[PDB]
Amino acid sequence: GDKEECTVPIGWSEPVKGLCKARFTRYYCMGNCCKVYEGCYTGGYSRMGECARNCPG
């Protein structure tokens, strides 16, 4: 098979935590791979299948 790498350094553009009393589940893209986030984020894609239709991975 054929795929590409997913370079995600410390200097990448990441989302911010909400520091609230709740823990939702959101999804974001990091260069070429989708990645789940948990902790009052509420931004980004709602599911992995909303991320993966727009990003290449």
Cα dihedral: 4, 29, 45, 51 (round 10): -10
Cα dihedral: 26, 29, 9, 7 (round 10): 140
Q: Which domain holds residue 33?
A: 22-57
The 3-state secondary structure of 1-57 reads: CCCCCCCCCCCCCCCCCCCCCCCCEEEEEECCEEEEEECCCCCCECCHHHHCCCCCC
Do 23 and 43 meet the contact criterion of CB atoms below 8 Å apart?
no
Q: What experiment produced this structure?
A: NMR
> CATH number for the domain including 44?
4.10.410.10
